[PDB]
Symmetry: C3
Subunit: 109 residues, 3 copies
């Protein structure tokens, strides 16, 4: 679809970027988006305020899709462009995240 | 475009979800979005706050398109996710909503 | 990607609609988004506040894409719907704007 996967990623990103300080509820609040094949026990709140999110396309993978978003994230005191990448897999109506997302510096240059 | 229907729907939703307590003004603020073929005299403010809107795709009808959005709707401080569906039809210069939107519970899993 | 031109255009619009009153700084902050072949020596802050941006689709050109967005701009606290059109060309690494954006009045009717 594209829309569907896009939207799904945005919802996941809302919880992934949550600032809940207690690691247990943080994981619990994002459990539903992440496949059981992934161990989220070491994921915690990332210390980063999500200021904007834009869908940056998908690439077909073997079992699903790799998706990208462009983000403005604020940390410490400064605001910068990142890309976030993660894989998803379709489920019987719906989606699941299947890798830990990678955050990297990005520019259009 | 897929984009143009998307954008049109977002605009309509802003008015559809408006909290105007006077049912006359509520209807007239959305009149231009909705086809004259549709009777909006019982539409009123829904008491819900729209916290977020994501385009969820369309599919063709004989006459136009059935569009879906995923919404975050809030009452008394708490949000839940819903799908909203409604039909649109192209007009010479734009688009019109041609059915009363259907608002339904939704989840990814 | 359609996604990618869309997002690029959003980032550009943020700088293009910046209200920076120093002409050299307004130009510098948007420099990387615009092709060097465009004369940006006379672009100034437009005195308009950008309340919302929705992607409105693209149209292939000889070397790129003509993109459109629907905007809510605010001038005095008087808000209105506008459309903005400009062209964009890929670069091996990303994208560049290649025309000066056209802003025009818009409605769905």
């Amino acid at each position: 679809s594209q829309s569907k996967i896009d939207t799904f990623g945005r919802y996941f990103l809302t919880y992934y970027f949550s600032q809940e300080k207690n690691q247990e509820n943080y994981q619990s609040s994002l459990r539903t988006y992440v496949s059981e094949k992934v161990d989220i026990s070491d994921w915690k709140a990332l210390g980063k305020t999500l200021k904007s999110v834009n869908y940056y396309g998908s690439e077909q993978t073997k079992k699903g899709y790799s998706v990208e978003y462009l983000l403005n994230v604020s940390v410490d005191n400064r605001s910068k462009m990142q890309k976030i990448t993660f894989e998803v897999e379709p489920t019987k109506n719906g989606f699941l995240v299947t890798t830990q997302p990678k955050l990297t510096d990005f520019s259009f240059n």
